[PDB]
Amino acid sequence: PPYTVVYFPVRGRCAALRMLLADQGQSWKEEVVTVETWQEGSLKASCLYGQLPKFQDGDLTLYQSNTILRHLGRTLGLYGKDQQEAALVDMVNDGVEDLRCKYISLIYTNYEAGKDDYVKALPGQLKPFETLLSQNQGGKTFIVGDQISFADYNLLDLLLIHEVLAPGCLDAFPLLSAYVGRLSARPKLKAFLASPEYVNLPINGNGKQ
Amino acid sequence: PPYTVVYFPVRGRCAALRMLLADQGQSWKEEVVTVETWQEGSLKASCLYGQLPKFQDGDLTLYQSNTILRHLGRTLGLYGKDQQEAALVDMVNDGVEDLRCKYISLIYTNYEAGKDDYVKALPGQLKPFETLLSQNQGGKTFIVGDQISFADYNLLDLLLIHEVLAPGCLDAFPLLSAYVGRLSARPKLKAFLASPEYVNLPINGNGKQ
Ligand SMILES: [NH3+][C@@H](CCC(=O)N[C@@H](CSCc1ccc(Br)cc1)C(=O)NCC(=O)O)C(=O)O
Ligand SMILES: [NH3+][C@@H](CCC(=O)N[C@@H](CSCc1ccc(Br)cc1)C(=O)NCC(=O)O)C(=O)O
DSSP states (O other), rough: OOEEEEESSSSSSGGGHHHHHHHOOOOEEEEOHHHHHTTTTTTTTGTSSSSSSSSEEETTTEHHHHHHHHHHHHHHSSSSSSHHHHHHHHHHHHHHHHHHHHHHHHHHHHHHHHHHHHHHHHHHHHHHHHHHHHHHHHHHHSSSSTTTOOHHHHHHHHHHHHHSSTTTTTTOOOHHHHHHHHTSSSSSHHHHSSSSSHHSSOOTSSOOO | OEEEEEEEOOOOOOOOHHHHHHTTTTTOEEEEOOHHTTTTTTTTGGSSSSSSSSEETEEEEEEEEEHHHHHHHHHTTOSSHHHHHHHHHHHHHHHHHHHHHHHHHHHHHHHHHHHHHHHHHHHHHHHHHHHHHHTTTGGOOEEEEEEHHHHHHHHHHHHHHHHHTTTTTTTTTTHHHHHHHHTTSSSHHHHHHTTTHTSSSSSSTOOOO
């Protein structure tokens, strides 16, 4: 710390790290970038990959959303209890990232023509996470081990955005439905999910959801 | 050894972890899956995300290529010297993965019509890595700090397959050109890149490159 997040005024790729910082009781500053200030290209040229989010932690600056999650994961102790759990946390996060990429492609390039097929294929894409919960203490704790990890906040966000795209998509998965319930109830996280800074931001940049 | 790699008979997403293992002097077993054995559905149905590579380290089974690289990075000491370097190693690997996804979409879905526009935009996509090297002791060492990391092997593979797709694409980048030369020369890695085990497998599964 202290932290600063730089991004567009949407939830998008910053939703999971904001949930992690709020639930861990950390403070941070937000620097909002409008499409107007982004279209003038001078901030875009200073970004390593010409994209946002950008993040600061003291004198360290970082890019890439999953690198920011892994960094808070290791500096705050949200990365498993050992190397074996740290590898399982990475395997869940990479799976969450693959489906997040398919969701983003549906939202930004084919929403009207491909949402029915995307929703027809959704059960198959969520089954792996229900299976991972069934293997960890009967799905009664977290996605890996018995302590929360950064992959829990990234998987929670992906489940919450899919319920907005296909209401009831989790009805067929008992353990994922119960897991979204338990984590949404953690005190600091429940207060943050009800706040205007979270509820009043669109999920995506094109208004689709 | 306690290692096993399960994959199709191509270099694909397994090329960087095989170079990492060979350069660190570790042995592993390969289990090859043919397209006929994959079409039998039983092994696909047993994979967590229905895809390969699969990897084992003793009884620990892992999926996702980047999870396998981070697990060997942690167990073999290829993850930076402190928490700040470990975050910069992740930032580099996430950039490498973003460019590998664009390369993969071109190869398997748009190779004939998108090859010239893809090669035209390539320099913009490679400049970030040239900038990272210029910031680390004049590009004379590794991509991060002064010890090799798992991201150096993934970046090296990404640079070698682009030189096959667009020969001379690295001429515009003096530090990346010298970085590929210096890394290909490490004795154990130089021997692996010249062996039939590496040279006789196609880069991708559809024959394009
Ligand atoms: N792999 C990177 C991807 C970052 C990324 O896609 N960044 C997009 C923004 S996220 C998606 C999006 C698009 C438009 C709005 Br309004 C809000 C959110 C960007 O900077 N895009 C700007 C650019 O590429 O010029 C990561 O995980 O961090
Ligand atoms: N995100 C995963 C992606 C793995 C993946 O895409 N896996 C593909 C194969 S890699 C690319 C490829 C394709 C065909 C051949 Br022949 C060789 C290599 C798969 O299992 N595909 C099988 C499936 O989806 O049924 C990772 O990083 O590990």
